[PDB]
Amino acid sequence: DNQFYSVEVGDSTFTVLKRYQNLKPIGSGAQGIVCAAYDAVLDRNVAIKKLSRPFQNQTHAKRAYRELVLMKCVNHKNIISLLNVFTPQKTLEEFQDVYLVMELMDANLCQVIQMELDHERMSYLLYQMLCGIKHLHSAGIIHRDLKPSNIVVKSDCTLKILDFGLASFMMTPYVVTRYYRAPEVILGMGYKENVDIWSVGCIMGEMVRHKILFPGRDYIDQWNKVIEQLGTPCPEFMKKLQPTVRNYVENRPKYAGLTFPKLFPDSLFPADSEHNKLKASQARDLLSKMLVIDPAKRISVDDALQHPYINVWYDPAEVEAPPPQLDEREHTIEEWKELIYKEVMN
Numbered sequence: 001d002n003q004f005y006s007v008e009v010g011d012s013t014f015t016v017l018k019r020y021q022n023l024k025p026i027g028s029g030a031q032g033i034v035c036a037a038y039d040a041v042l043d044r045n046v047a048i049k050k051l052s053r054p055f056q057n058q059t060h061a062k063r064a065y066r067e068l069v070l071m072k073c074v075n076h077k078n079i080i081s082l083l084n085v086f087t088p089q090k091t092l093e094e095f096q097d098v099y100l101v102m103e104l105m106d107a108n109l110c111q112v113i114q115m116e117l118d119h120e121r122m123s124y125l126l127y128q129m130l131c132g133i134k135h136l137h138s139a140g141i142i143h144r145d146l147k148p149s150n151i152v153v154k155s156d157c158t159l160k161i162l163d164f165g166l167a168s169f170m171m172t173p174y175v176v177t178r179y180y181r182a183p184e185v186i187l188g189m190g191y192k193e194n195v196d197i198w199s200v201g202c203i204m205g206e207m208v209r210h211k212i213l214f215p216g217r218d219y220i221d222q223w224n225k226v227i228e229q230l231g232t233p234c235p236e237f238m239k240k241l242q243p244t245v246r247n248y249v250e251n252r253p254k255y256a257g258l259t260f261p262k263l264f265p266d267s268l269f270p271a272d273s274e275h276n277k278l279k280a281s282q283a284r285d286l287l288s289k290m291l292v293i294d295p296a297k298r299i300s301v302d303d304a305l306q307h308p309y310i311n312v313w314y315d316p317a318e319v320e321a322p323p324p325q326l327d328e329r330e331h332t333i334e335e336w337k338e339l340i341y342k343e344v345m346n
Protein backbone atom coordinates (compact mmCIF):
# COMPACT_ATOMS: atom_id res chain seq x y z
CA ASP A 1 0.00 0.00 0.00
CA ASN A 2 2.56 2.55 1.16
CA GLN A 3 4.93 3.83 -1.51
CA PHE A 4 8.07 3.78 0.67
CA TYR A 5 10.15 1.37 2.74
CA SER A 6 13.07 1.76 5.13
CA VAL A 7 16.45 0.04 5.47
CA GLU A 8 19.56 0.69 7.55
CA VAL A 9 22.65 1.46 5.46
CA GLY A 10 25.83 1.95 7.44
CA ASP A 11 24.23 3.59 10.48
CA SER A 12 21.76 5.90 8.68
CA THR A 13 18.13 5.04 7.92
CA PHE A 14 17.10 5.31 4.26
CA THR A 15 13.35 5.62 3.57
CA VAL A 16 13.02 5.43 -0.22
CA LEU A 17 10.43 4.67 -2.88
CA LYS A 18 9.90 0.97 -3.50
CA ARG A 19 11.25 1.29 -7.05
CA TYR A 20 14.77 1.53 -5.57
CA GLN A 21 16.11 -1.85 -4.46
CA ASN A 22 19.36 -3.35 -3.18
CA LEU A 23 20.76 -0.31 -1.38
CA LYS A 24 24.53 -0.39 -0.75
CA PRO A 25 26.67 2.45 0.64
CA ILE A 26 29.27 4.18 -1.52
CA GLY A 27 30.07 7.43 0.28
CA SER A 28 29.61 9.75 3.26
CA GLY A 29 30.61 13.27 4.23
CA ALA A 30 29.51 16.90 4.34
CA GLN A 31 25.76 17.09 3.75
CA GLY A 32 24.57 13.62 2.76
CA ILE A 33 24.98 9.87 3.09
CA VAL A 34 24.78 8.16 -0.31
CA CYS A 35 23.70 4.73 -1.57
CA ALA A 36 23.83 2.84 -4.83
CA ALA A 37 20.60 1.14 -5.86
CA TYR A 38 18.74 -0.50 -8.73
CA ASP A 39 15.80 1.50 -10.13
CA ALA A 40 13.27 -1.16 -11.12
CA VAL A 41 11.22 1.43 -13.04
CA LEU A 42 14.07 2.76 -15.20
CA ASP A 43 15.96 -0.58 -15.16
CA ARG A 44 19.27 1.08 -14.30
CA ASN A 45 21.54 1.71 -11.33
CA VAL A 46 21.29 5.03 -9.49
CA ALA A 47 22.89 6.94 -6.64
CA ILE A 48 20.63 8.18 -3.83
CA LYS A 49 21.68 11.02 -1.50
CA LYS A 50 19.81 11.71 1.75
CA LEU A 51 19.61 15.30 3.00
CA SER A 52 18.78 14.97 6.71
CA ARG A 53 16.71 18.02 7.72
CA PRO A 54 18.56 20.41 5.38
CA PHE A 55 16.73 23.32 7.04
CA GLN A 56 18.34 22.72 10.45
CA ASN A 57 20.70 25.68 9.96
CA GLN A 58 21.66 28.39 7.51
CA THR A 59 24.66 26.66 5.94
CA HIS A 60 22.81 23.42 5.21
CA ALA A 61 19.67 25.26 4.10
CA LYS A 62 21.21 27.77 1.68
CA ARG A 63 23.18 25.01 -0.06
CA ALA A 64 20.23 22.61 -0.24
CA TYR A 65 17.85 25.24 -1.62
CA ARG A 66 20.47 26.69 -3.98
CA GLU A 67 21.43 23.34 -5.50
CA LEU A 68 17.80 22.25 -5.83
CA VAL A 69 17.08 25.52 -7.66
CA LEU A 70 20.23 25.61 -9.78
CA MET A 71 19.90 22.06 -11.07
CA LYS A 72 16.81 23.11 -13.03
CA CYS A 73 18.83 25.95 -14.59
CA VAL A 74 21.63 23.85 -16.14
CA ASN A 75 21.40 21.10 -18.76
CA HIS A 76 24.75 19.62 -19.78
CA LYS A 77 26.26 16.14 -19.81
CA ASN A 78 29.25 17.14 -17.66
CA ILE A 79 26.99 18.65 -14.96
CA ILE A 80 24.76 16.85 -12.45
CA SER A 81 21.19 16.20 -13.57
CA LEU A 82 18.71 14.55 -11.22
CA LEU A 83 16.49 11.62 -12.12
CA ASN A 84 14.22 12.14 -9.11
CA VAL A 85 13.61 14.17 -5.96
CA PHE A 86 11.30 13.03 -3.18
CA THR A 87 10.52 13.11 0.51
CA PRO A 88 8.75 10.23 2.28
CA GLN A 89 7.08 12.76 4.57
CA LYS A 90 3.54 13.72 3.71
CA THR A 91 2.97 17.32 4.83
CA LEU A 92 5.10 20.36 5.60
CA GLU A 93 4.74 19.89 9.36
CA GLU A 94 6.08 16.32 9.09
CA PHE A 95 8.80 17.17 6.55
CA GLN A 96 12.36 16.23 7.49
CA ASP A 97 14.39 14.58 4.71
CA VAL A 98 15.04 15.11 1.01
CA TYR A 99 16.27 12.32 -1.27
CA LEU A 100 18.14 13.11 -4.49
CA VAL A 101 18.62 10.51 -7.23
CA MET A 102 21.02 10.51 -10.17
CA GLU A 103 22.77 8.11 -12.51
CA LEU A 104 25.18 5.79 -10.72
CA MET A 105 28.76 6.53 -11.76
CA ASP A 106 31.85 4.35 -11.24
CA ALA A 107 34.37 6.34 -9.18
CA ASN A 108 35.26 9.63 -7.53
CA LEU A 109 37.86 11.81 -9.24
CA CYS A 110 40.06 11.46 -6.15
CA GLN A 111 40.29 7.77 -7.06
CA VAL A 112 41.26 8.53 -10.67
CA ILE A 113 43.90 11.04 -9.52
CA GLN A 114 45.77 8.27 -7.69
CA MET A 115 46.16 6.28 -10.94
CA GLU A 116 48.69 6.55 -13.74
CA LEU A 117 46.72 8.04 -16.64
CA ASP A 118 47.92 8.34 -20.21
CA HIS A 119 47.65 11.73 -21.90
CA GLU A 120 44.47 10.78 -23.77
CA ARG A 121 42.52 10.18 -20.56
CA MET A 122 44.00 13.13 -18.65
CA SER A 123 43.30 15.57 -21.48
CA TYR A 124 39.77 14.18 -21.91
CA LEU A 125 38.99 14.54 -18.20
CA LEU A 126 40.32 18.11 -18.24
CA TYR A 127 38.42 18.91 -21.43
CA GLN A 128 35.18 17.76 -19.80
CA MET A 129 35.90 19.73 -16.63
CA LEU A 130 36.36 22.87 -18.75
CA CYS A 131 33.17 22.18 -20.74
CA GLY A 132 31.15 21.89 -17.54
CA ILE A 133 32.71 25.00 -16.01
CA LYS A 134 31.99 26.86 -19.25
CA HIS A 135 28.35 25.76 -19.13
CA LEU A 136 28.09 26.94 -15.52
CA HIS A 137 29.59 30.32 -16.41
CA SER A 138 27.23 30.74 -19.37
CA ALA A 139 24.34 30.26 -16.92
CA GLY A 140 25.79 32.95 -14.64
CA ILE A 141 27.25 30.43 -12.17
CA ILE A 142 30.85 30.90 -11.03
CA HIS A 143 31.76 27.91 -8.89
CA ARG A 144 34.79 29.04 -6.81
CA ASP A 145 35.06 25.71 -4.91
CA LEU A 146 35.69 23.07 -7.56
CA LYS A 147 37.40 20.03 -6.05
CA PRO A 148 37.86 16.36 -7.00
CA SER A 149 35.67 14.92 -4.23
CA ASN A 150 32.63 16.50 -5.94
CA ILE A 151 33.51 15.13 -9.40
CA VAL A 152 32.55 11.61 -10.48
CA VAL A 153 33.63 9.47 -13.43
CA LYS A 154 32.48 6.41 -15.36
CA SER A 155 34.68 3.63 -16.70
CA ASP A 156 34.38 5.14 -20.20
CA CYS A 157 36.15 8.41 -19.09
CA THR A 158 32.94 10.47 -18.91
CA LEU A 159 32.79 12.98 -16.09
CA LYS A 160 30.24 14.98 -14.10
CA ILE A 161 30.55 17.89 -11.67
CA LEU A 162 28.12 17.36 -8.78
CA ASP A 163 27.93 20.74 -6.99
CA PHE A 164 27.56 24.45 -7.72
CA GLY A 165 30.15 26.04 -5.45
CA LEU A 166 30.20 28.84 -2.93
CA ALA A 167 27.57 31.33 -1.87
CA SER A 168 29.33 30.08 7.66
CA PHE A 169 29.68 27.82 10.69
CA MET A 170 29.36 24.05 11.15
CA MET A 171 28.89 22.50 14.61
CA THR A 172 29.84 19.04 13.37
CA PRO A 173 32.80 16.69 12.72
CA TYR A 174 32.79 18.13 9.20
CA VAL A 175 35.73 20.03 7.71
CA VAL A 176 35.87 21.84 4.37
CA THR A 177 38.52 21.04 1.76
CA ARG A 178 40.11 24.34 0.69
CA TYR A 179 43.23 23.28 -1.22
CA TYR A 180 41.75 23.92 -4.69
CA ARG A 181 40.49 27.48 -4.08
CA ALA A 182 42.01 30.34 -6.03
CA PRO A 183 44.08 33.16 -4.49
CA GLU A 184 41.04 35.39 -5.06
CA VAL A 185 39.16 33.18 -2.60
CA ILE A 186 42.05 32.66 -0.17
CA LEU A 187 42.64 36.42 0.02
CA GLY A 188 39.07 37.74 -0.31
CA MET A 189 39.69 39.64 -3.53
CA GLY A 190 36.65 39.30 -5.72
CA TYR A 191 36.83 37.34 -8.89
CA LYS A 192 35.74 36.61 -12.44
CA GLU A 193 35.10 33.42 -14.40
CA ASN A 194 38.75 32.31 -14.52
CA VAL A 195 38.78 31.82 -10.71
CA ASP A 196 37.73 28.26 -11.56
CA ILE A 197 40.72 27.77 -13.89
CA TRP A 198 42.99 27.80 -10.84
CA SER A 199 41.12 24.84 -9.36
CA VAL A 200 41.43 22.92 -12.63
CA GLY A 201 45.16 23.61 -12.56
CA CYS A 202 45.31 22.30 -9.00
CA ILE A 203 43.51 19.13 -10.11
CA MET A 204 45.73 18.86 -13.20
CA GLY A 205 48.92 19.23 -11.17
CA GLU A 206 47.78 16.68 -8.60
CA MET A 207 47.17 14.14 -11.39
CA VAL A 208 50.82 14.59 -12.38
CA ARG A 209 52.40 14.89 -8.93
CA HIS A 210 50.01 12.58 -7.01
CA LYS A 211 50.23 15.04 -4.12
CA ILE A 212 48.05 17.99 -3.17
CA LEU A 213 49.84 21.04 -4.55
CA PHE A 214 48.89 23.55 -1.84
CA PRO A 215 48.08 21.75 1.43
CA GLY A 216 47.73 23.42 4.81
CA ARG A 217 45.89 23.61 8.12
CA ASP A 218 44.37 26.96 7.11
CA TYR A 219 44.68 29.66 4.46
CA ILE A 220 47.87 30.77 6.27
CA ASP A 221 49.65 27.48 5.55
CA GLN A 222 48.02 27.26 2.11
CA TRP A 223 49.25 30.68 0.98
CA ASN A 224 52.77 29.71 2.09
CA LYS A 225 52.72 26.69 -0.24
CA VAL A 226 51.46 28.89 -3.08
CA ILE A 227 54.24 31.48 -2.90
CA GLU A 228 56.96 28.94 -2.04
CA GLN A 229 56.32 27.24 -5.40
CA LEU A 230 55.01 29.92 -7.79
CA GLY A 231 56.87 32.85 -6.21
CA THR A 232 55.71 36.12 -4.72
CA PRO A 233 53.21 37.83 -7.06
CA CYS A 234 54.03 41.07 -8.86
CA PRO A 235 53.21 44.52 -7.44
CA GLU A 236 50.44 44.79 -10.05
CA PHE A 237 48.72 41.99 -8.13
CA MET A 238 49.35 43.56 -4.72
CA LYS A 239 47.42 46.69 -5.73
CA LYS A 240 44.25 44.61 -6.22
CA LEU A 241 44.41 43.64 -2.55
CA GLN A 242 42.33 45.19 0.22
CA PRO A 243 44.66 47.36 2.31
CA THR A 244 44.89 45.03 5.35
CA VAL A 245 45.33 41.79 3.39
CA ARG A 246 47.89 43.62 1.24
CA ASN A 247 50.00 44.32 4.32
CA TYR A 248 50.01 40.66 5.38
CA VAL A 249 50.84 39.43 1.88
CA GLU A 250 53.59 41.99 1.24
CA ASN A 251 55.21 41.23 4.62
CA ARG A 252 55.35 37.48 3.96
CA PRO A 253 58.88 36.19 3.23
CA LYS A 254 59.72 36.77 -0.43
CA TYR A 255 60.44 33.71 -2.58
CA ALA A 256 61.57 33.63 -6.21
CA GLY A 257 59.39 30.66 -7.17
CA LEU A 258 60.30 27.50 -9.07
CA THR A 259 60.12 27.11 -12.82
CA PHE A 260 57.49 24.70 -14.07
CA PRO A 261 60.05 22.20 -15.40
CA LYS A 262 61.20 21.96 -11.77
CA LEU A 263 57.65 21.96 -10.37
CA PHE A 264 56.60 19.21 -12.82
CA PRO A 265 59.78 17.47 -14.02
CA ASP A 266 59.97 15.18 -17.02
CA SER A 267 59.90 12.13 -14.74
CA LEU A 268 56.23 12.65 -13.89
CA PHE A 269 55.08 12.42 -17.51
CA PRO A 270 54.68 9.69 -20.11
CA ALA A 271 57.56 10.59 -22.41
CA ASP A 272 58.92 7.51 -24.18
CA SER A 273 57.48 8.07 -27.67
CA GLU A 274 57.73 11.33 -29.59
CA HIS A 275 53.95 11.66 -29.26
CA ASN A 276 54.26 11.45 -25.47
CA LYS A 277 57.29 13.77 -25.36
CA LEU A 278 55.24 16.42 -27.17
CA LYS A 279 52.17 15.93 -24.97
CA ALA A 280 54.27 16.28 -21.81
CA SER A 281 55.51 19.68 -23.00
CA GLN A 282 51.95 20.72 -23.90
CA ALA A 283 50.71 19.57 -20.49
CA ARG A 284 53.36 21.55 -18.62
CA ASP A 285 52.60 24.57 -20.82
CA LEU A 286 48.90 24.49 -19.93
CA LEU A 287 49.76 24.00 -16.25
CA SER A 288 52.01 27.06 -16.35
CA LYS A 289 49.09 29.11 -17.74
CA MET A 290 46.40 28.09 -15.22
CA LEU A 291 48.57 27.92 -12.06
CA VAL A 292 49.04 31.69 -12.21
CA ILE A 293 48.45 33.71 -9.04
CA ASP A 294 47.30 36.93 -10.71
CA PRO A 295 43.92 36.36 -12.44
CA ALA A 296 44.74 39.12 -14.94
CA LYS A 297 47.57 36.88 -16.19
CA ARG A 298 45.77 33.53 -15.80
CA ILE A 299 44.36 31.80 -18.86
CA SER A 300 40.62 31.94 -19.53
CA VAL A 301 38.25 29.01 -19.90
CA ASP A 302 37.80 29.69 -23.62
CA ASP A 303 41.55 29.92 -24.26
CA ALA A 304 42.19 26.78 -22.20
CA LEU A 305 39.69 24.97 -24.42
CA GLN A 306 41.77 26.05 -27.45
CA HIS A 307 45.05 24.86 -25.93
CA PRO A 308 46.75 22.08 -27.96
CA TYR A 309 46.64 19.72 -24.97
CA ILE A 310 42.86 20.14 -24.79
CA ASN A 311 41.41 20.94 -28.21
CA VAL A 312 41.96 17.47 -29.70
CA TRP A 313 38.55 16.68 -28.14
CA TYR A 314 36.80 19.89 -29.29
CA ASP A 315 33.29 19.95 -30.81
CA PRO A 316 30.81 22.87 -30.92
CA ALA A 317 27.91 20.89 -29.44
CA GLU A 318 29.84 20.23 -26.21
CA VAL A 319 31.40 23.58 -25.29
CA GLU A 320 28.49 25.86 -26.28
CA ALA A 321 25.10 24.37 -25.35
CA PRO A 322 22.17 26.80 -24.95
CA PRO A 323 21.96 28.20 -21.40
CA PRO A 324 18.65 28.67 -19.52
CA GLN A 325 14.18 30.99 -8.60
CA LEU A 326 16.84 33.60 -7.77
CA ASP A 327 19.36 33.36 -4.92
CA GLU A 328 17.78 34.25 -1.59
CA ARG A 329 18.87 35.93 1.63
CA GLU A 330 18.74 35.18 5.37
CA HIS A 331 15.70 33.22 6.56
CA THR A 332 14.61 31.39 9.68
CA ILE A 333 14.58 27.62 10.10
CA GLU A 334 10.82 27.72 9.55
CA GLU A 335 11.14 29.77 6.36
CA TRP A 336 13.88 27.58 4.88
CA LYS A 337 11.85 24.44 5.62
CA GLU A 338 8.92 25.76 3.57
CA LEU A 339 11.16 27.03 0.76
CA ILE A 340 12.85 23.65 0.42
CA TYR A 341 9.64 21.65 0.85
CA LYS A 342 7.96 23.68 -1.89
CA GLU A 343 10.88 23.18 -4.28
CA VAL A 344 10.93 19.45 -3.47
CA MET A 345 7.34 19.02 -4.72
CA ASN A 346 7.17 21.69 -7.43
Ligand SMILES: CNC(=O)c1cc(-n2ncc3cc(Nc4c(F)cccc4Cl)c(COC)cc32)cs1
Nearest residue numbers: 027034047048049100101102104105106107108162
Ligand atom coordinates in the same frame (compact mmCIF):
# COMPACT_ATOMS: atom_id res chain seq x y z
C1 LIG B 1 30.30 1.51 -8.49
N1 LIG B 1 30.15 2.93 -8.29
C2 LIG B 1 30.95 3.61 -7.29
O1 LIG B 1 31.72 2.99 -6.62
C3 LIG B 1 30.79 5.10 -7.08
C4 LIG B 1 29.63 5.86 -7.50
C5 LIG B 1 29.77 7.28 -7.17
N2 LIG B 1 28.70 8.20 -7.47
N3 LIG B 1 27.95 8.14 -8.57
C6 LIG B 1 27.09 9.09 -8.42
C7 LIG B 1 27.22 9.81 -7.19
C8 LIG B 1 26.58 10.86 -6.59
C9 LIG B 1 26.98 11.32 -5.33
N4 LIG B 1 26.25 12.42 -4.73
C10 LIG B 1 24.86 12.64 -5.13
C11 LIG B 1 23.97 11.66 -5.20
F1 LIG B 1 24.29 10.37 -4.87
C12 LIG B 1 22.54 11.94 -5.65
C13 LIG B 1 22.18 13.17 -5.97
C14 LIG B 1 23.19 14.30 -5.90
C15 LIG B 1 24.42 14.04 -5.52
CL1 LIG B 1 25.61 15.34 -5.43
C16 LIG B 1 28.07 10.69 -4.66
C17 LIG B 1 28.58 11.14 -3.30
O2 LIG B 1 29.75 11.87 -3.52
C18 LIG B 1 30.42 12.32 -2.37
C19 LIG B 1 28.71 9.63 -5.28
C20 LIG B 1 28.30 9.20 -6.51
C21 LIG B 1 30.97 7.59 -6.51
S1 LIG B 1 31.94 6.18 -6.30
